[PDB]
Amino acid sequence: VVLSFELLHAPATVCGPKKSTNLVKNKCVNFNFNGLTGTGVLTESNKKFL
Amino acid sequence: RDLPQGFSALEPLVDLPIGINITRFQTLLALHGAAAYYVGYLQPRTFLLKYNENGTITDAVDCALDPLSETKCTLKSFTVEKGI
Ligand SMILES: *[C@@H]1O[C@H](CO)[C@@H](O[C@@H]2O[C@H](CO)[C@@H](O[C@@H]3O[C@H](CO)[C@@H](O)[C@H](O)[C@@H]3O)[C@H](O)[C@H]2NC(C)=O)[C@H](O)[C@H]1NC(C)=O
Numbered sequence: 651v652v653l654s655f656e657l658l659h660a661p662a663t664v665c666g667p668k669k670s671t672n673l674v675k676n677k678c679v680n681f682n683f684n685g686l687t688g689t690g691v692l693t694e695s696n697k698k699f700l
Numbered sequence: 701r702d703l704p705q706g707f708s709a710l711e712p713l714v715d716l717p718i719g720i721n722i723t724r725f726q727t728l729l730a731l732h733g734a735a736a737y738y739v740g741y742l743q744p745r746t747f748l749l750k751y752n753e754n755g756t757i758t759d760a761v762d763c764a765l766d767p768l769s770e771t772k773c774t775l776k777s778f779t780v781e782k783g784i
Pocket residue numbers: 698754756
């Protein structure tokens with residue numbers, strides 16, 4: 651069976667699940683949400699979302 | 701009715717990696733007083749986008765429609781007081 655990764659100029663969103671693990675609450679850490687990083691206090695946040 | 705003097709928005713649904721230019725488009729109906737679907741264009745311009753606490757659009761002004769357009773475009777406000 652042949653698996654060909656067609657990486658043209660077309661966007662890269664067909665990807666692999668890397669390391670989705672337990673959410674790190676209240677421990678100062680960076681994050682990797684598909685390409686964005688930053689030292690975050692990642693816990694449940696008090697705002698509305700859309 | 702007409703395109704009312706009012707407010708609206710949109711929402712993304714599908715990523716379509718086309719990669720080629722588009723020339724034309726055509727609609728699909730099935731028939732057989734003033735109702736009509738209006739088609740103009742979109743232009744390489746720049747606008748102003750004011751947002752609320754909920755995170756929703758409220759107002760909008762162009763940059764190149766008029767002097768007021770660039771006035772709001774650069775002054776980074778919607779009140780925008782007098783001056784040069
Ligand atoms: C903006 O975010 C707020 C935050 O929740 C949203 O508020 C909600 O608004 C709806 C109607 O717009 C409220 O429903 C109303 O509930 C009251 C009782 O609470 C009832 O008496 C009314 O007849 C109506 O059913 C809803 O309660 C309210 N949320 C809360 C927690 O009170 C609002 O909808 C958001 N707006 C947009 C445009 O996203």
